[PDB]
Amino acid sequence: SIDRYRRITKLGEGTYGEVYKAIDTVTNETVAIKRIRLEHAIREVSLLKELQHRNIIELKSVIHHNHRLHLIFEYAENDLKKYMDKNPDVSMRVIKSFLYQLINGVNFCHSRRCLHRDLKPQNLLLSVTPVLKIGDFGLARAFGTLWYRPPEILLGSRHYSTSVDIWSIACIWAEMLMKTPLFPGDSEIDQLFKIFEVLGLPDDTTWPGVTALPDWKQSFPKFRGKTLKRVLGALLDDEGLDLLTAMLEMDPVKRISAKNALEHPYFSHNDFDP
Numbered sequence: 001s002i003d004r005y006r007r008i009t010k011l012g013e014g015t016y017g018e019v020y021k022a023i024d025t026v027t028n029e030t031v032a033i034k035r036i037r038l039e040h041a042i043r044e045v046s047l048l049k050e051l052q053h054r055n056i057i058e059l060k061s062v063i064h065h066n067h068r069l070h071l072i073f074e075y076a077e078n079d080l081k082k083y084m085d086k087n088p089d090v091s092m093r094v095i096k097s098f099l100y101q102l103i104n105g106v107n108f109c110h111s112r113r114c115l116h117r118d119l120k121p122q123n124l125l126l127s128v129t130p131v132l133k134i135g136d137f138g139l140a141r142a143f144g145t146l147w148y149r150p151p152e153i154l155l156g157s158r159h160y161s162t163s164v165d166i167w168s169i170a171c172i173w174a175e176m177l178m179k180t181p182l183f184p185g186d187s188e189i190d191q192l193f194k195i196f197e198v199l200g201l202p203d204d205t206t207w208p209g210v211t212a213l214p215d216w217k218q219s220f221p222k223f224r225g226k227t228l229k230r231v232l233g234a235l236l237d238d239e240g241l242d243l244l245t246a247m248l249e250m251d252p253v254k255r256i257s258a259k260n261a262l263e264h265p266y267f268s269h270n271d272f273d274p
Contacts, residue, residue: 078126
């Protein structure tokens, strides 16, 4: 279609290629256009059109013309990083709303067997309390910071489960509360150290199979764990700390599902905007 889109304004370079905003002359609405640089698909990305949910940036159209690939998405002006920068005094209610909305979107996608794999504040767009909408679900798989990366990936597991995204959510949540990243590693190993420093060094009881992961080191320091309570326990009520702890299980198989997170008592109090 791509001649349906006018006033195409480059916004920058994103993960996969250049990113633009444009006017969809059919609806007169602003849309986002992402050029997807390839070379080493259309059916696969087109399946993402089914991910229609208020907390998910809608994939509106897949345009594959003259050997180039563009995705047309719902546009959101703002994003979480920009928002947190502009709103130092953001209320706990807003944070908890954003968190619920994030988990709700993720649960929706996970229920459709669609993983994100690269959640970060930069792909949490905010539209209109703003409505949080997750961008780029499915793109990491369809097309190939460590701060939000879970330990099983850092330790070289090739298996991405739904649990990956849950980890990232907890890291994002922690950052909303702390205003600094929970685990600001500067390398895969430094990232693991940052995680282990808080959560302790795993073993084959706490995380069965961990020592058989490709990048497990027998020589890792025997971190006991500062504990999440020590790190941000001042910022969160008890139920909130319980949920975060469940999302930051290092063994991905013990990590709380998005579905169970939404069912957690933390979200039973009507003190947030869904």
